[model samples]
Target: MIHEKYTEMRNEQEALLSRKNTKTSFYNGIYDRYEHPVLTREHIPLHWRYDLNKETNPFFQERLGINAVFNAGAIKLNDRYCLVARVEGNDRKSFFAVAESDKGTEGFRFRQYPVCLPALTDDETNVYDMRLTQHEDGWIYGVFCVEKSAGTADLSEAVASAGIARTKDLTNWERLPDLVTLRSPQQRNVTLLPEFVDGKYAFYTRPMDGFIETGSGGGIGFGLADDITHAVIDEERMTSIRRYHTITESKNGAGATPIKTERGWLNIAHGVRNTAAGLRYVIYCFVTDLSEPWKVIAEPGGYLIAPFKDERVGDVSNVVFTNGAIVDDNGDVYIYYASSDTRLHVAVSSIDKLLDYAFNTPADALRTAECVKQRCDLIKRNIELL
Candidate 1:
């Protein structure tokens, strides 16, 4: 089995779409009146260097933009941990930056916050959902989504893969090769999910057509690739994990970042559709088999969580989108997502519960659960790390 009960829970959430009325009313209060989760109220270390200056640092204002938040990739280097982030640079060219805070600096000092490694440039264009891997040959492989250009919203999109190597010094980077191109001229919303399986590297990406540009459309397909770095399909190793849900790229939809859950790979994805009101981003999942991944073990066709109908969530309203989240030592999954389209928000769950629903729900009960436990653990941890 590709996945256990988690897959059913996932598919259930995939079919989950938030009610337009409650979504709007909820965020309306959140953006204006609700001051519980204030961005300024956090007790971060004083020297914690987070540039709030919109002009100088484009994180909240221009960097996060009206688009999507990039996922951070974790790598433990020489007994120290480093996080990789894909940020839209002030220079207009989005690049990969490293968060300097590691395990070495156990002291929670303001000076020990995560800093961007201004030295390295992974890609020139807008990159999202960063996936990092350390190879035996001392080479590091990072896979992410590549936009057509830095700022412009051209429709040309593809999954770009690159290799990072520094035999002499760790300062320079060599453009190794394009791992896999998930998009054709006709595809959109191709989110890549790469993982290590059966001794080789396997990458996953969703291919959808018309849904991005067209308002009403249906196309949900997932693809797999072996030896993501090699261009040739020598193994030609690829297949559709499952064909379910109407994956929309209508500005609000995106592919979920697949994490290693005990059951199987938990794909926390979003299903979007634009209406007369505004863009809506709904969260869900689909658990596929681990070994025979093509089979759908479970489908959570319901809303896992949605954003408060507030301003911080978005410049618009009723939009809650998640790029990805990190799982802890326990079976707890911390889903860190963007609110309304603005700031970030977090929701948590016991690993087993999420798996139980994703793999066991039916068509009628798909995404029926609106009760996702809100935990501030990962948020607190991220703040401490930041």
Candidate 2:
């Protein structure tokens, strides 16, 4: 009789808690607001999935055990598309590999080869978060975040120092001496503009700290300099840049080199929002003024894509992160993104649809609140299953 009574009480408590949580979730989902258009989405064939095998680099297995691979930067080299993909080992030390596929078609397979490793610095440095874009001179320019003082047990001790490198072919890389050492731990996602704007070199960086104290919370922002090597790293200057969040309050960061279009510089980016389940990563596109790169021309009314089922079941769940994209002869954008933080995947869209959503679509017509609510609910359901 006593045991039965106790069981009944516990069930009652659980029911009450669940009711409260549902209410909380609704309010949380309802208030969050954003404006971006829904993007058409698809997946690369399953055979194209990047899987680790015996020939897979030992560095990858030793450092990032069973971790999902995602976050690649893409560009066009001649008639093919090239992707610089991040493949970290179990140890969390990052490595890069180059993969290529034929242009004008999505049915082709990718051939990959390891291209670079973190340039070590007294056990203080390793590289990750790389972006590659071809400059007018035909050289492929790149930037990456080098982790300094990486020897500590705490990952936060590692400071990200930006490094510049260039390559004629994706296979060979040459590092330059010019580097930017962030004053704080929060600065990340360093990407250089494909070409100079008005003879001034520009790059984008997202600051993760000092937003609360200094009021410039880490969001995507740009830096300008007379030369690529001379760009200044100023947190105060970041105050002038707006957060790249178009549809939600989640953190935003620059992805891939900006694609030059007739309308302006079309770019792809990643944004993350906190949910009851955890953090969900999504992809979106935006246009920046060609002349004034800092000016955001048109942002979509909603996210281009979100985490799908396969993407929600990897090393990290609920992530669709990207670092690069390329345009085909037909003006279709082939966006390469990492799925569930595990495998490489691509999504296709036309230039006209992207431009229409960003510029022609009226902001007032956006179903920002509804879209955010649906996203939140989906995440909540995933959390409940977990």
Candidate 3:
């Protein structure tokens, strides 16, 4: 009898505490109101059902459920804030699909078909974690990691090729040649800058020495490439390196395409730290120099977004990977991130707040006394003001 009552109470609390804050909310509120993780598999419409048993269906399973929709690339396309989402099918395969809303926050639903990315090579396989840049050249450029089997004897590895595609409208896409740089054979989390630098295309590249981990290539980078298809990472121009005991101690990559501000190009980047449980991912911000775009100018220490509460529980667990963020004409920034590589989420902030946070927030102090003092100082100020 006691066990039955406990089970009922647990069920009731789980029902009540399931976090789904899709509507517009802010950075501050009551306790436990730190709202994020809005969209899940349940929030996405079941739009792919019409072709379940059809012969033309490309998917493995006859019927498919959206296993997950995460690592979406966001942009304001015409009247809608559209996400070219990394949609995962129940068969555990990944592809890009469009999900859009008027306000960029609520009522986000999927479109008809997954994005049709034509293969450049016969070996090409999966695509995910796209970064969209509506460049000054008037074409929406998407850079994502193209996965292909490494031809290993045990089938243990895959190569991450930096893939590129462009579209005038989000509906029809044109494929470009995949990027190959000398820095590393394995490239992932590649992003293009929206504007030209020195009359040439520039990008953020995270090169991995191995298929999974960066055996040698572990830092974030900025490089200029004259050709969109072919790119190069400069020997000296590597961007952020790993800092000790920080969120990005393990690995880091540029998440969103850098949003240009008067201060500099504001970038939302993902940082990883290895935990005993697994690899924990978080999002942080850094800015690049206006003139020397390769140089990272203002990087406030630590993360802007981290997995909290229910977000830490999902397909991968303890992962919050951001594919991109979009800045509205009204200055509000829509941060689109994923939860445990399973569901999508958004956090709203303004250009003003982001700039202030980047400039005003202190970087991590090497000295212990100063680090604790910074925390205490902020706490003391907040306490006395209220």
Candidate 4:
């Protein structure tokens, strides 16, 4: 009896030790540190040498201060890192400028000028926030918010529309037709998947009633398109949504293009909730079905990252937004986010841990009581171990 008890205890100890050692990377996913607020408005050059935006911003104003340089889309173009930022001008209007870096972290420089996106129908009044996605179709496409002239006599208050453009290098850009749907999709946050689904362009959408305030934007929509030359969405369906008393209660939208994983497609999205101090924005993660990209699979509750300390100090206070994330050939992921709608920041993580968190985290329970119990259950477990 004594010998049996000793064997059982000693074998269990070995198993426990192995289990604890395996959690190092999982913990690092929460505690890992990297340089942040990487690209600031100060990094922008005073003036441009090329006339790329000469037609757009014909009146060149000497740069006294950049209004704001935030909301960048990151990707590895050619070999180096390329980030196209919504470089707001001193005049308060925003345009896009392509910036490049060697290691994707340091030694960053912008092109001579912004990429000229000509309005196909003289409808585009302002273009804001460019999102870059290198589609498996062998083209790097950019989808942005186009404030088109609604012929509103309201003086520059245009309607929100989506525009797309494609390029190989920064050398030449080809603008595509208006991204329209059967029932006009007045959206700001729109992105496309890198891979095709059912021989069609799969996209994530946030169809909104208003541009600045999207309170009624019905979660995130999934749709398909057959052509980009003159694309029109035949079908769009919502797979996930915001709920009351939750962090995503106010509204949420796609943060970056979902990263394909063995478990599923890991999706990072932004959530917003109304506070007395106004609205607070955060970042969260989820997973979508591998076979059906439209269906959201593993649902993680709450947010993965929020506006902390100095991060809350930006042009748009109490907000941290991401429209881009790049994955190394290895498991490393570089999350490019904008804080306070003022500057750009980067966070380091691993694909392994992100997947684990997406799958293992307690999913948001539809009921309030069950939801609170899930968290209390986690707390009790922690207390027992401690």
In model 1, the Cα lDDT at residue 139 comes to 62
Clashes, model 2: 19
**What does candidate 2's lDDT look like per residue over 1-386, in tens digits?**
12233355446534432322111111221121112101111122122222234345322222224243457777778877777767655566666766555642233333444665436356544666678878775678778766666456976655556677788887778776544535444456677777786676677777665221222454567666565645455531241233344444566777767778788877777777777987777877678888776777777555666765545777678887778777777867766777776666666566776677667543423355876776687689899996
Model 3 spans > 4 angstroms off: 1-38, 43-47, 50-62, 229-236, 376-386
> Model 3 — TM-score against the truth?
0.86
Clashes of 4: 0
Over 218-337, each residue of candidate 1 has an lDDT whose tens digit, in order, gives 334445445444532222222322223333335333344556576776766666666688667666677767775545566654556655445334454666555545455566454545
Where does model 2 exceed 4 Å of error? 1-67, 103-113, 117-120, 150-156, 181-186, 210-215, 229-248, 364-386
Q: Count steric clashes of candidate 3.
A: 0
Sort by TM-score, top down from the best: 3, 4, 2, 1
Q: What are the lDDT scores of the predictions, listed in order? A: 0.43, 0.60, 0.77, 0.75
In model 4, the Cα lDDT at residue 254 comes to: 85
For candidate 4, the 10 contiguous residues with the lowest summed lDDT are 17-26
* Tens digit of per-residue lDDT, candidate 3, span 1-386: 13233355446534433433544334442112235454566654433632433345544232567788799999988878898988788887798888777766666766766788898898877888889999988899999988888887868677788889999777788898887777677887889988888888988888778665865665787778787755555442678777768878888888988899999989889888888998988988888888887788898878888887788898899998888887888887888888888888777778988888878778877568888998998999999986
Query: Can you tell me which runs of candidate 1 are displaced by over 4 Å?
Result: 1-83, 89-93, 98-124, 132-141, 149-175, 186-199, 208-211, 214-220, 232-256, 311-313, 364-386
Which should have the higher TM-score, number 2 or number 3? Answer: 3
Give the best candidate by TM-score.
Answer: 3
Alpha-carbon error at 62 in model 1, in Å? Answer: 13
Instruction: Report the C-alpha lDDT of model 4 over 1-386, residue by residue, as the tens digit.
Output: 13233355446534432221111222334434334455666666543421224444445434355778888888888677787888876677788888787665555667776778777776566787777788889998888888876666777556787789998885577999878866544876788888888898888888777655664546888888898777788666876688887778788888877788988878888899999988999989888897897788888878887876678887789998887887888887878888898888777778888887878888778687897898798899999996
